[PDB]
Target: Protein sll0617
Amino acid sequence: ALFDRLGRVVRANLNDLVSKAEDPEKVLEQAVIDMQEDLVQLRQAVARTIAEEKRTEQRLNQDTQEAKKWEDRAKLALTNGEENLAREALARKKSLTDTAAAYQTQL
Amino acid sequence: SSATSAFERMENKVLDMEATSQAAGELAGFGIENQFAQLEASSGVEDELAALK
Amino acid sequence: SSATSAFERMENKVLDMEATSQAAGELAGFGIENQFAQLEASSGVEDELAALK
Amino acid sequence: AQQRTMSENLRRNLAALEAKISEAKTKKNMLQARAKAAKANAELQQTLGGLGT
Amino acid sequence: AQQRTMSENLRRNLAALEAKISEAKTKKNMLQARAKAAKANAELQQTLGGLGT
Model:
């Protein structure tokens, strides 16, 4: 691995060169600036995530109200002597309540 | 390809953009409450002094 | 090649297209009854209260 | 009798679709308002925020 | 009679497929959410540690 040691020397000399080329305050300020911009982007991403959270909550709470509507329609149909519409309404409510359950879990 | 599916797709986009703006504000340093509560309490005692006199 | 055979062929086509539209609505999620029945019952009791007073 | 039975069915379905389209157009307006508000909020929070250079 | 016997099975199978597709859409949305969360966590963890050249 003698060629490896030669390459190591070539790399170390370039590293010394680039390290002597580094001004102290210039590179320090830029290290701060880059961290600042990365923090910008990261904060934006965390905002997107936290936002998807509330958006999930919204659909959850809305499927709940739709389920209550379908239940009330089933009741009203059963009160008028229609045993067919109420069954489908109960089934739709069951589907929406399953969806609400899953949404609650993921939330 | 239906009009309603296009409508729903943009609707969800808009709602996400509202939520994103909300979240961005909270991460930036919310300040639309701590001041409101103070103003409320201060105007409260001010109303009491005005009513009294 | 007769006029009547052409007439019958298009007639059957049109009737199938009506049936297709009907079926498509049922598959999409029919909603031209569940609401009508509710409106009917609600206006029913409304008529009773109006007549009574 | 046939004409009347069919033309009434079509009116129920048209009425349902009219309720549906008008729902979307009033939502369209308020959603565009909500979207513009969200876009603007995000830009001001970023600009008046001290984060970034 | 034969056609209605076929149509009942067709309706049941289509309903099964529709349930599968609704489940698929919900899973897709939650998977997008989880993937965004994972990417954000990865960027965060990478920025925190002083790791790499």
Observations:
- Residues 3 and 9 of chain A are 10 Å apart (CA to CA).
- Helices of chain A lie at 2-20, 24-78, 85-106.
- The longest helix of chain A spans residues 24-78.
